[PDB]
């Protein structure tokens, strides 16, 4: 099912990049394609940042109690939290990313899809960082997302999520303008081809509206300098 799907290692380009760098301290380029944007790269060394950006640093410092690191990748956030003495569980659908996390010393790294009906555990803080909205994919998945959050959150728990308003990319020189933040991507590493995926960017007002429609409250915590922000989502009282 869509909700339980994991990446096969043979179609796991980001995991393969991470594993090359972990095992060999060297890597080819992780290439990113899109129907909306020209071909680019995701720098691989930066996936191992200790050096994190403002919004991510802000979120880690605020994270308390039992923490879920969603889409944890190389384990950078999970390792930072462990070093603070914090309790963290990390999840990712990438098998090679989970391999690396374990070998780097993440104590509780699991290969599981956030949306899996069988994934059941509760948390005081749920971290969705590095365009944390991405995993949601499309606005039509907002109800599913908030249903899952209700299952995973302890009383007085919160979700800390960063995203970006991409409107500026879709305007002409004079500012004249599916939701524009519904992007698709596909990645390639060496001869490893990943399947295309939906990756949601969401502006704060849109996020607040969908939160309110699903029994959540959104709070702006911090703005960055490139149309980016950190929000806190909680179950509405």
Ligand X SMILES: Nc1ncnc2c1ncn2[C@@H]1O[C@H](CSCC[C@H](N)C(=O)O)[C@@H](O)[C@H]1O
The residues of the shown chain that bind ligand X, judged by CB under 6 A, are 14, 47, 70-73, 76, 91-94, 97, 113-115, 129-130, 135
For residues 112 and 209, which CB has a smaller minimum distance to ligand X in the complex? 112
**Measured between alpha carbons, how far is 19 from 26 in angstroms, rounded to an integer?**
10
For residues 33 and 176, which CB has a smaller minimum distance to ligand X in the complex? 33
CB of 129 to ligand X, least distance (A): 5
CB of 76 to ligand X, least distance (A): 6
CB of 97 to ligand X, least distance (A): 5
For residues 135 and 142, which CB has a smaller minimum distance to ligand X in the complex? 135
Residue matched to tokens 């603070």: 84
For residues 28 and 217, which CB has a smaller minimum distance to ligand X in the complex? 28
CB of 217 to ligand X, least distance (A): 24
CB of 93 to ligand X, least distance (A): 4
CA distances from 26 to 16, 22, 159 (A): 12, 8, 35
**Measured between alpha carbons, how far is 92 from 112 in angstroms, rounded to an integer?**
6
- Cβ atoms 21, 15 nearer than 8 A: no
Q: Is 113 annotated as a binding residue?
A: yes
Give start and end residues of each alpha helix (H) in 84-141: 95-104
Q: Is 3 annotated as a binding residue?
A: no
For residues 115 and 123, which CB has a smaller minimum distance to ligand X in the complex? 115
- Cβ atoms 73, 96 nearer than 8 A: no
Q: Is 114 annotated as a binding residue?
A: yes
- Give every CB contact of residue 83 below 8 A, 6+ residues apart in sequence: none
Could you list the residues known to form a binding site for S-adenosyl-L-homocysteine, using ranges: 49, 92, 113-114
């Amino acid at each position: 099912s869509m909700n339980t799907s994991l990446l096969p290692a043979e179609k796991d380009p980001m995991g393969a990049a991470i594993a090359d760098f972990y095992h060999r301290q060297k890597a080819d380029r992780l290439r990113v394609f899109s129907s909306q944007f020209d071909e680019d790269e995701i720098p691989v060394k930066q996936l191992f940042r200790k050096q994190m950006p403002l919004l991510e640093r802000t979120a880690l410092a605020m994270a308390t109690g039992t923490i879920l690191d969603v889409g944890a990748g190389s384990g950078c956030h999970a390792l930072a939290l462990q070093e603070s003495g914090k309790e963290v569980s990390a999840i990712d659908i990438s098998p090679l990313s989970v391999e690396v996390m374990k070998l780097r010393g993440v104590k509780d790294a699991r290969q599981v899809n956030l949306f899996d009906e069988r994934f059941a555990a509760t948390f005081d803080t749920i971290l969705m960082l590095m365009n944390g909205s991405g995993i949601i994919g499309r606005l039509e998945n907002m109800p599913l997302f908030f249903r899952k959050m209700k299952q995973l959150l302890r009383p007085d728990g919160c979700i800390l999520m960063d995203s970006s308003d991409l409107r500026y990319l879709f305007e002409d020189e004079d500012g004249s303008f599916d939701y524009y933040g519904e992007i698709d991507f596909r990645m390639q590493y060496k001869d490893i081809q990943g399947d295309p995926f939906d990756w949601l960017y969401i502006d704060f007002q849109t996020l607040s509206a969908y939160a309110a429609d699903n029994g959540f409250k959104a709070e702006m915590i911090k703005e960055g300098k490139h149309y980016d922000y950190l929000a806190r989502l909680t179950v509405a009282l």
